[PDB]
Amino acid sequence: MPNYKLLYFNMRGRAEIIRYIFAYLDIKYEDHRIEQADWPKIKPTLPFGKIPVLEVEGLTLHQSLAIARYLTKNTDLAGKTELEQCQVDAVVDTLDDFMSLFPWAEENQDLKERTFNDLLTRQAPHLLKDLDTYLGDKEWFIGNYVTWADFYWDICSTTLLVLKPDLLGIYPRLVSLRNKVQAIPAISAWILKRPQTKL
Amino acid sequence: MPNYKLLYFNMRGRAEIIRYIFAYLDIKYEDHRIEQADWPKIKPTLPFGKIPVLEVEGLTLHQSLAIARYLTKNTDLAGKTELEQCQVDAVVDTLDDFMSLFPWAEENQDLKERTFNDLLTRQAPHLLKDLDTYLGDKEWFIGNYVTWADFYWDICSTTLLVLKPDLLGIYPRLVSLRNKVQAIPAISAWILKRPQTKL
Ligand SMILES: N[C@@H](CCC(=O)N[C@@H](CS)C(=O)NCC(=O)O)C(=O)O
Ligand SMILES: N[C@@H](CCC(=O)N[C@@H](CS)C(=O)NCC(=O)O)C(=O)O
């Protein structure tokens, strides 16, 4: 129904969860991508000087997870009951907590590459085992229906595999889960048309 | 109506936003506080091995902001419309993004004290000016009614003032806002009865 304008860098990054939700709900929007070179001109015009932001009817929303949660309201993706909605939120928060540990902006490319290494080999196995245990034998994180938490797992694991290709080898269940998310038609189409980018 | 069991350390920390919401809604709950010494015994029994957690009818919820958002649903505290709910969420996320930068677990008490210094003197002014600009002359962040975003500002600014006492001197509006939150009867009562703790 309404017109949407997503603004972010030409990368999956923080905006990708929003792009998945739009794809799934078949909601049209302008996927406005900017190059790093353009950022300096744009940054000062945004509320809290950061992206992504969503222009909705001339109102600029910010914060990717706040926007994702807003787009999924009164939708099954958010979770059917209030208890499930909290569980969906908790999983996205657990995954985001981890991805936030990565020093993506680290200037020192030595320390960075060395921290990435620690994270990927020391902490990840703990996150993965709890996540695996949580998922158990359910079809999706929450149960028998897909939620935006499952989308987030696909989004997060994609970048992580770019970092450490063999990261998921010991977790077939987590593998099957991301495979399932990727098989959903609306997502498969998006994945194929989406710009090939590293992060 | 239902029985609640909050589990966390004896500190405001991550669980304080939940304690504010309970106080305001006048919902009874067991405020179970544990000492650091007990943590090792408890940690392995929790889903993702972290606190706070909320036991509701024998179901363990986790992630403070996921729980806070669940408790505030179908309540004015969450924001009246879907657009305002997104804005309330976004403010909480902006404030949490910042507080997360603080290396609270830093072993190296030199680096830590030195990073805290940087954050407090270089980044905070930027967060504070955007926050101030956002609030403008509204009574509360969202407008003419209190939301859990306002609670969060009181919670976050409390710890920050423990760090840098003169941090808010240049922002009278942000000061008036936290003073207003503190004047709400249910909050005033909580503040007075809550255990005096540093963080
Ligand atoms: N939690 C926020 C984080 C926003 C954020 O840090 N965005 C970065 C890009 S990943 C940004 O705006 N960088 C440009 C800058 O801060 O100068 C969100 O998810 O939207
Ligand atoms: N974003 C999470 C953070 C959880 C977290 O880091 N909790 C800390 C206490 S503030 C914890 O569990 N510490 C014990 C440990 O990790 O060993 C939340 O808000 O619940």
> A76-183 architecture in CATH?
Up-down Bundle (1.20)
Distance from CA of B83 to the nearest CA of A (A): 8
Angle ∠(B120,B122,B125) on CA atoms, nearest 5? 80
Give residue A14 CA to ligand 1 midpoint distance, Å: 8
What type of residue is B174? L
Q: Return the structure tokens found at B185.
A: 């009867």
Residues of A annotated as catalytic are 8, 14, 104
The DSSP code for A43 is G
Beta carbons of A49 and B94 less than 8 angstroms apart: no
Spell out the long-range contacts of A118-121 with Cβ–Cβ below 8 A and sequence spacing 24 or more.
Answer: A120/A160, A120/A163, A120/A164, A120/A167, A121/A164
CA distance B80 to B78: 7
Contact state of B63 with A100 under an 8 Å Cβ cutoff: no
Q: Is A148 annotated as a binding residue?
A: no
Ligand 2 atom showing the smallest separation from residue B65 Cα: 19
Q: How far is CA B121 from the centre of its chain?
A: 21
The structure tokens 């208890």 sit at A83
Q: Which of B85, B94, B126 sits opposite A63 (nearest CB)?
A: B94
The DSSP code for B195 is P
Please name which of B94, B101, B87, B77 lies closest in space to residue B130, comparing C-alpha atoms: B94
Question: 3-class SS at A7?
Answer: strand
Tell me if chain A has a CB within 8 Å of the CB of B135: no
Tell me if chain A has a CB within 8 Å of the CB of B83: yes
Tell me if chain A has a CB within 8 Å of the CB of B199: no
C-alpha distance from residue A133 to each of A136, A165, B25, B46, B47 (Å): 5, 22, 34, 12, 9
Tell me if chain A has a CB within 8 Å of the CB of B82: yes
Q: B113 — phi, psi (to 5°)? A: -55, -25
Residue B123: other Cβ atoms inside 10 A: 12
Sheet with A4-9, side-by-side order of all strands: A30-34, A4-9, A53-56, A59-62
Contact state of B94 with A62 under an 8 Å Cβ cutoff: yes
Give residue B93 CA to ligand 1 midpoint distance, Å: 11
Give the number of whichever ligand sits closest to the CA of residue A93: 2
In chain B, what is the straight-line distance between the N-terminal and C-terminal CA atoms, in Å?
Answer: 30
Domain ranges within chain B, ordered by starting residue: 1-75+184-199, 76-183
Phi-psi region of B142 (alpha: psi -120 to 50; beta: other; left: phi over 0): alpha
Q: Which of B62, B70, B82 sits opposite A82 (nearest CB)?
A: B70
Tell which CATH classification among 3.40.50.10860, 3.30.230.10, 3.40.30.10, 3.30.70.260 matches the domain B1-75+184-199: 3.40.30.10
Q: What are the start-end ranges of the H helices in B59-184? A: 64-71, 82-101, 109-118, 124-135, 148-163, 172-183
Please name which of A18, A6, A33, A30 lies closest in space to residue A195, comparing C-alpha atoms: A33
Cis peptide before A185 (omega within 30 of 0): no
